[PDB]
Amino acid sequence: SGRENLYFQGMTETFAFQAEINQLMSLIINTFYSNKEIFLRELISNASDACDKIRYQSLTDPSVLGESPRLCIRVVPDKENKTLTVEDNGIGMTKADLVNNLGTIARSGTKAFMEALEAGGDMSMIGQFGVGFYSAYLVADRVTVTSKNNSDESYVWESSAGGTFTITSTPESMKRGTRITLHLKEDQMEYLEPRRLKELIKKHSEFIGYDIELMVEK
Ligand SMILES: Nc1ncnc2c1ncn2[C@@H]1O[C@H](COP(=O)(O)OP(=O)(O)O)[C@@H](O)[C@H]1O
Ligand SMILES: [Mg+2]
Numbered sequence: 754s755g756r757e758n759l760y761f762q763g764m765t766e767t768f769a770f771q772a773e774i775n776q777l778m779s780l781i782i783n784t785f786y787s788n789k790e791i792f793l794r795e796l797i798s799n800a801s802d803a804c805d806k807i808r809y810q811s812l813t814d815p816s817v818l819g820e821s822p823r824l825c826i827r828v829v830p831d832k833e834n835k836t837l838t839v840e841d842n843g844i845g846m847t848k849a850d851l852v853n854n855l856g857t858i859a860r861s862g863t864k865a866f867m868e869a870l871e872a873g874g875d876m877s878m879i880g881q882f883g884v885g886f887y888s889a890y891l892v893a894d895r896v897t898v899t900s901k902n903n904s905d906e907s908y909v910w911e912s913s914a915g916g917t918f919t920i921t922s923t924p925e926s927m928k929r930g931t932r933i934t935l936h937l938k939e940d941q942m943e944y945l946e947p948r949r950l951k952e953l954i955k956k957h958s959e960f961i962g963y964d965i966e967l968m969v970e971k
Pocket of ligand 1: 841846885930
């Protein structure tokens, strides 16, 4: 009468965020900040880290790469849907990884980061406080993370920073890796511009050891 029923189509589970993470998300989504572009660097850094994980695993067991051995990153603007997406074919996240690493496990630097912000600290230091992912809310009102790890099924994590996130699964599903889609806020449409993205990618990617392909629309 669940996943095994002939008529089953999918399931969505709702989770609350760890208290400080919720506080941080409310702070980020509502704050005024004049250098919001740093969100892109955080997305690319996470893609790179995920590619490193599978790359090193592949040195002992090449079979982990399956049919996608060429590790790379894609940046996908979508003017029609008002979304910016960052895709990788890195290690991917299991259902547990999504629930644990994206909202429920406490990050020791969460409190210190919010305290730093009030004291005149730099929002660009977000990554150094171990909460880089949440910078997406500087430019987006909704974030959708689709991920597939070799040891699990594909799942979709989603949140509009309202105190909860969802985890969605379907019987059929996404190759290994992660796709992070940001639904941009009304005044953040510049991150859909090819020129703005090309320069921003070049700005914080001389150190990234993977090809970063900017997908052109129209
Ligand atoms: N593209 C991705 N692929 C795999 N795991 C990811 C990805 N993006 C984020 N994560 C996970 O979310 C966690 C939190 O990301 P972040 O807030 O940037 O912290 P950090 O990179 O310092 O660990 C990461 O540690 C990782 O487990
Ligand atoms: Mg990171």
